[PDB]
């Protein structure tokens, strides 16, 4: 069986031919007080020729705009140390620490989508005086813990049994690991802004951290080895797909300060020029 699926191409409007006019129709006179934006084209104000326009608005749809991978977290962890908390990495899941993807997401109030997640892991040797040894390939474990699950205390804790938590095992020299996640929220859509509190007495925690609660990630080395110490760095990449967004907002002007708040320092509207009439001259012999 084969099924033919049709794809409607969507191009921009053609401009029509127009001639001289002398009448009572005033397309160029409006009133912005109504909250309405004028729908006037060049053919209403000047004389125009007919043009057949073949341009398409395909790369500005929301799906093509948001469906690319971006880094959201980077972290380090060791194979040998004297701290036992630096032997594994762990963090809470969100998209608020890297400013590019998070400014791109905050153009809208609410978003809903599935996700594709990729990891990029690299290792390196720690600076020691005596070098020289052959080491077998390293293996890494990534575990996702939804809220309420037990938390590892070390790299040999029983919790890495991962009986019900989903985990990834990977070894260096292969393709980067990848998996997809569905839309997981107790609400009908994700919320990027929340003008409210956590306690009914209008106090407690304000803003975004009240609503996310999506678990944690833990990463470790599996070998448990290496008399000479090594160091690994893990980077995580998000890619949304099957997207829907609501209620657009003005883009962020000020620089970000931290991952919890919308706090900012006052910034200008733009940079200056000489005077309200200044023109740069570019046609000179």
């Amino acid at each position: 069986v084969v099924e033919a699926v049709e794809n409607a191409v969507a191009r921009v409007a053609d401009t029509i031919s127009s001639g001289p006019s002398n009448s009572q129709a005033v397309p160029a006179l409006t009133a912005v007080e109504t909250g309405h934006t004028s729908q006037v084209t060049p053919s209403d104000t000047i004389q125009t020729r007919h043009v057949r326009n073949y341009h398409s608005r395909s790369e500005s749809s929301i799906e093509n705009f948001l469906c690319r991978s971006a880094c959201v977290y980077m972290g380090e962890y060791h194979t040998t140390n004297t701290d036992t908390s630096k032997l594994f990495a762990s963090w809470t899941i969100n998209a608020r620490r890297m400013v590019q993807m998070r400014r791109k997401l905050e153009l809208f109030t609410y978003v809903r989508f599935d996700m594709e997640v990729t990891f990029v892991i690299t290792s390196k040797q720690d600076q020691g005086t005596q070098l020289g040894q052959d080491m077998p390939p390293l293996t890494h474990q990534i575990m996702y813990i939804p809220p309420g699950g037990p938390i590892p205390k070390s790299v040999t804790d029983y919790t890495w049994q991962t009986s019900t938590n989903p985990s990834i095992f990977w070894t260096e020299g292969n393709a980067p690991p990848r998996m997809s996640i569905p839309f997981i929220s107790i609400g009908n859509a994700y919320s990027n802004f929340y003008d409210g509190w956590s306690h009914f007495s209008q106090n407690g925690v304000y803003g975004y951290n009240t609503l996310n609660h999506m678990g944690q990630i833990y990463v470790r080395h599996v070998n448990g080895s290496s008399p000479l110490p090594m160091t690994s760095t893990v980077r995580m990449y998000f890619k949304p797909k099957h997207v829907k967004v609501w209620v657009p907002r003005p883009p962020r002007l000020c620089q970000y300060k931290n991952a919890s708040t919308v706090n900012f320092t006052p910034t200008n509207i733009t940079e200056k020029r000489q005077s309200i009439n200044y023109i740069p001259e570019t046609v000179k012999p």
């Binding site: 909250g35 009908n188 009914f200 209008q202 907002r249 962020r252 000020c254 006052p266």
Partner: protein, 251 residues
Amino acid sequence: DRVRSITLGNSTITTQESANVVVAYGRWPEYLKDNEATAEDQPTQPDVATCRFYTLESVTWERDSPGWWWKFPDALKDMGLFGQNMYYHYLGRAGYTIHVQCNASKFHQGCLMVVCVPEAEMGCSQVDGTVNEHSLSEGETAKKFASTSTNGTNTVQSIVTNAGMGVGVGNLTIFPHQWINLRTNNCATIVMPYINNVPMDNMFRHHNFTLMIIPFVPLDYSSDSSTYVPITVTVAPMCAEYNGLRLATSL
């Protein structure tokens, strides 16, 4: 074409110099349907005791005035039976009709922007800090935008150019809005439906939208024209529903 009349409950507003009416995103308020509900108990619908125009207190537009904002709900929690139905239930839901009035003579000048911002989350004047609710809202009294950068603790960073949200104030036209240009009209009207990511919500914990009034062209006049020019707001809830009746909460 410039005259308009709006009736709700036992209240009516007339106007003789209106521009038009903005319907937020082409959507009128309505009740919750059966294939979108999650709460199971039968809801109450008072329908004329709550859905009527309430008037707040007025502000004075001066020659150097930065602007004002209110938070909705929590500006109507002491208004008649709407406030009482807010105090006894866990979940509420309503749309609104907003009407702003400001009149002046043909020898005055000035221009105001009237805008409704959903989920307007604000920042503190101390960047290593958090806000409190008194700095966000004073009920029926308005908060005041500032003229320069603010300092000190516990106050909201309120210089008008950033609108206290870290954006450019000239882009707020992305939201539902109108203008009051003193030579053209004397009132603005916005009809706002229920906008949230869940079908109902608690009305004390969550501010659904902020109302901002910001003058772009200051007020000016000459020798012996009237100096006192007030601005007045009037709001009416629509399709109001409540769920989860228990004893009255106390703030």
